[PDB]
Design an enzyme around this catalytic site. Structure first.
Site, PDB file in Angstrom:
ATOM      1  N   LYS B 157       0.861  -1.181   0.000  1.00  0.00           N
ATOM      2  CA  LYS B 157       0.000   0.000   0.000  1.00  0.00           C
ATOM      3  C   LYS B 157       0.895   1.228   0.000  1.00  0.00           C
ATOM      4  CE  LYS B 157      -3.456   0.164   2.764  1.00  0.00           C
ATOM      5  NZ  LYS B 157      -4.215   0.191   4.047  1.00  0.00           N
ATOM      6  N   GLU B 315      -7.020 -11.570  -2.566  1.00  0.00           N
ATOM      7  CA  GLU B 315      -6.362 -11.057  -1.372  1.00  0.00           C
ATOM      8  C   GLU B 315      -7.290 -11.387  -0.203  1.00  0.00           C
ATOM      9  OE1 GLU B 315      -5.984  -6.914  -2.248  1.00  0.00           O
ATOM     10  OE2 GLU B 315      -8.109  -6.542  -1.831  1.00  0.00           O
TER      11      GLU B 315
END
Ligand SMILES: [Mn+2]
Ligand SMILES: [Mn+2]
Ligand SMILES: [Mn+2]
Ligand SMILES: [Mn+2]
Lengths: 360, 360, 360, 360
Positions: B157, B315
């Site tokens: 991220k 995910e």
């Protein structure tokens, strides 16, 4: 409070570079409050339709008489009236709107940024244009500005010399400074698309952060193609001559960054309309300048303080080029930024003595 | 069997990272069968329009009362009724649809995947987000996950730090892992197009497999340009807030991969409508998550098992971040995958004791 | 041979309507030949960026100084120099080019039309604007103009009143005139696209031949839509503020007719470039005016005589609105047309007394 | 100076139609000044993502806590903070911005319209929705409203019945009213493009002035096609759920008129950004409502008074549907308009007794 009088004064100030002409506006209101604004451009008619002489002539003969007698505190009504009576004339309108906001800020005791909604910061990153023409001198100057922590973002004006020469000069500067500084170029519409194709590639490949206005605003299709192909992002500047131009470029996908100039849009409030359009479209921002002195610089600064984000900073270094100014308060530049106080209006007052000395 | 009661319970669970809030739905039917569902989001209102509090308030005041008395076995009629009465509210709708499918699966003795048409696989590849912030720690964690054969696809991220910093961090991780792992990034709409232009190039050039949602969903044109120019494929996530958004992005050529989230579409059946559109357009798939616990994870998993192909994996690692859960059956993660049993419904049962302990 | 001096004089002349302000240019050459030009606008700044005051200020301060000493016989080099030093300023440029062409024509003993290549006609159809505001009065004035064979093409300026009111007024006039006259309207950017949708339809279904500039130039998409849907042809006027605008409009298909004005393009030669672009795109032509007196009217006319075809005639009636003129030779209006002589230059001489009288 | 507390109260008021639920916001500042706002929707969740229940839940749990302690006089910073922490939630945001503007206006002694820049008018044209369902009854109600000079613009909500039935109903009303009133329709996304094709044609050919939101916002291409083919102008309402949607619609040419609603945009300041985008694109404006009571109606009005032009008037009749109100000052409807005073803030005070009475 009513608008009682508006004066447009042409002032020529010596620069460290050899002279800069500003049109200083003074709007006096019936309540005794005075607002000051600035309408400044570069090189007569070379960087726009309005010259200092034309600006003063139109303010005196057309714009000012339309405002005498109107409420000084209803800026929207005053500016809308000017739009109804005058096409274009954004520099003149900008100076006038700046003065009305100044007078309104003093009257209410609020900094112009608060009148515009409220600031989200107190300072703005300020870039510096390297203008010695000489590569070694430019790297030396850049290293000095870095040393004294005044600037870490440098702009290079190119397009006047053979492409190959300008390219070598820019790449040499970025190569020597490395990651210590951000290096950008401004081509000021000097290249045609055929020249920009290879030049944008070379610059993007050698660490230039952005390419400002590589080609002429008349070539919309070329701007769209370069926006999609240049390795470095394309910033629109001269392509924006009004708020409506900003919508058009955004709708076309002609640039990924917009330079925001109050003079090209029509004032601090108008520049915000352009910034809002850019925001709604996902277009990045940069605070531009027309080399204004402290008055116009601060008026730009006050609008920029309210913006959510300016990804590329500003080039509000205009006051730094003047040897003398006509205001009492010198701008505060330190630690790569321009610091804006929370004083009423623009936070500036005219130095009557220097004004009389430099006025025409 | 009729829907008799629906309860929406807010549960705060400790995480290994420090707390995750879930809205657990329990739909009790007249035939004595109970279905369970989950409506979970990240960070209150930061990652969507619906918060845990708003979800419970709307279910209790509007959605649930519209369903009491309807046939529990006609899921299409129940969900269509919710669409007629409520605009948006996909997270709430997702939790409800998940519970009805669970109850229907138990009632018929079929796993939800079979209710949706039939599974073409029993397990799903599961990626892992490296979140230590520290580069050395991230490489160490990744090497551990590889060693224990739990994950070989890692997500990073980025977008919160200066671009240059995030780029170095990501490239360092891919460089150290080499061909042993797939490295992807998720920018969560943090960059504007001007920043993404160069960042996407650098990432694509250094072996990053895909770039998830680099810029904001408000910039459609920018997504289309990046889809055509980025060296690494662009995945749409936040740009999809409904099935209709998926058709729009597909028709525009805005992304070559779609993240599929039941919460953003409105449930397991809705996510399949989006997947089918992507399929008809030639767009690749990825099974996404909103960090659901086992209930929402399994409901996503059951729909993903029916898909012809998920080129980029999933995910579905949400349960792995929770220290405690409110179901009795722990998920089976082994050999880089999540294994889904062929038990009725979602194959899960609530742990009444831990539920009472963590409920608000 | 050399440009020795350039004088810009503001003259206020009485109209049949109220005054009209002209900026008369007098260019004196080293060989004793003098050329005259005109830069005229309407309503100060209400119809353009340049006012009489700003025009004179810029000529005296920037434009004229750049020309003194240059060869008077190399007009291309002179005008290119002005483009390099000044952005826009088409009215001032037009006045200067007209004067240089007048001087050159007197110098070679050729009318300006021959300098520009060669005329293909000796007269131009001239329309007339019915501006009384009273429908009955307009029909009467129209009937008269037809009676004395002066005009048979009439133009109504609309947009300032409620739509249904202007529509009624226009339709009534065409109904009463029938096949006797061509009736057209100029909306002067007064409607937004939403109002223009129904208005253009009604006008087109009632015999109106063309609709001039119904909406604002800022709305490019709307012009393209109206160009495809209006039952009557759409003419661009204000959308053209430069030759490059003409190219843009043509490339986009924003109008099927272009109004040609030397003042909006930059002079007689500039208007020909715009006309050439229109011809290459298959776009219709119309000879426009900014209500110039004889100097400006003749400079436009001389350029228009070289055009292959002007499908929609011209509106070169400017001289007919003035009660007093500053030239010795009054225009030859006869049999619905303006007749242009084959005399040197523009074929006009300044009445030094009246000039001195109305000069401000 | 500082925001001390924010209270969100759900109030159920009786209408002339049945109740209407409002969420009244009361923001208390450290300097004793209190500001009031309103977040109101229609039909729970049938007309939007936010319900009164969800709105209060989110304000109490997420929005209010983020504001306590912040400067009450820096509205820009406060609202930007809310955008950072919360996605969407425009109704809640609108209510909060309205209250902060009310407080600030009372604090500086300026009406909200002046805080927003300056009003250019003091009253707004107000339309009326004929909602009896009975054609004869509607014509009667319309004739009456005309008689007492309260309304002369009427809006019919259609789409729930078979097309030919709604068309007959609408055409009959316009036929009976003739040139006496402007008749418009709002289809509220009820038709699909296939039904809208013929309906828009029939309505347009029978004097209907504008067609509001004929099809669903999910069908972007259909809106663009209807915008080019409908004989009556198309207005976007539900297609605008954010300021960025407005930019998108404008760039695409999906509507020639935009309905402006503070609730769908995020407040009085947000609605101005949408209005500015429309203006820059040449799109017409209309002042919309979500059937707010006086607080919300005045907050909309104050923003609308600063607009250059609202070609299609407004529908700010919300207060007229309520039999009971929670403010002390009843709205001034007279001569087809809503009159707005020049008093501080919104110019409204809460009737503490009635508030306590209808508060739930
Ligand atoms: Mn520049
Ligand atoms: Mn994501
Ligand atoms: Mn015209
Ligand atoms: Mn509506």
């Amino acid at each position: 409070a009513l608008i009682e009088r508006i004066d447009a004064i042409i002032v020529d100030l010596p620069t460290i570079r050899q002279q800069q002409t500003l049109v200083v506006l003074r709007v006096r209101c019936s309540d005794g409050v005075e607002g000051i604004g600035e309408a400044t451009t570069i090189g007569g008619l070379a960087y726009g339709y309005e010259s200092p002489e034309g600006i003063k002539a139109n303010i005196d003969a057309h714009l000012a008489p339309a405002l005498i007698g109107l409420a000084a505190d209803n800026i929207n009504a005053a500016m809308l009236k000017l739009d109804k009576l005058a096409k274009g004339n954004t520099f003149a309108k900008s100076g006038i709107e700046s003065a009305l906001l100044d007078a309104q800020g003093k009257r209410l005791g609020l900094p112009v940024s608060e009148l515009l909604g409220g600031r989200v910061r107190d300072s703005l990153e300020v870039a510096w244009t390297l203008a010695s023409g000489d590569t070694a001198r430019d790297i030396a100057e850049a290293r000095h500005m870095l040393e004294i922590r005044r600037h870490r973002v440098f702009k290079l004006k190119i397009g006047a010399n053979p492409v190959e020469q300008d390219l070598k000069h820019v790449v040499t500067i970025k190569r020597e400074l490395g990651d210590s500084a951000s290096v950008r170029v401004d081509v000021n519409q000097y290249w045609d698309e055929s020249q920009a194709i290879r030049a944008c590639q070379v610059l993007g490949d050698n660490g230039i952060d952005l390419i400002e206005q590589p080609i002429s605003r008349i070539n919309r299709g070329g701007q769209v193609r370069l926006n999609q192909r240049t390795p470095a992002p394309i910033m629109a500047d001269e392509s924006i001559e009004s708020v409506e131009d900003a919508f058009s470029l955004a709708a076309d996908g002609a640039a990924s960054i917009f330079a925001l100039k109050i003079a090209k849009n029509g004032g601090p409030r108008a520049v915000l309309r352009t910034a809002q359009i850019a925001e709604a479209a996902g277009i990045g921002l940069y605070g531009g300048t027309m080399l204004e002195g402290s008055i116009g610089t601060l008026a730009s600064a006050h609008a920029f303080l309210t913006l959510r984000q300016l990804t590329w900073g500003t080039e509000l270094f205009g006051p730094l080029l003047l040897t003398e100014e006509i205001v009492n308060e010198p701008p505060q530049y330190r630690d790569f930024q321009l610091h804006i106080p929370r004083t009423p209006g623009l936070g500036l007052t005219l130095d009557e003595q220097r004004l009389a000395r430099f006025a025409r």
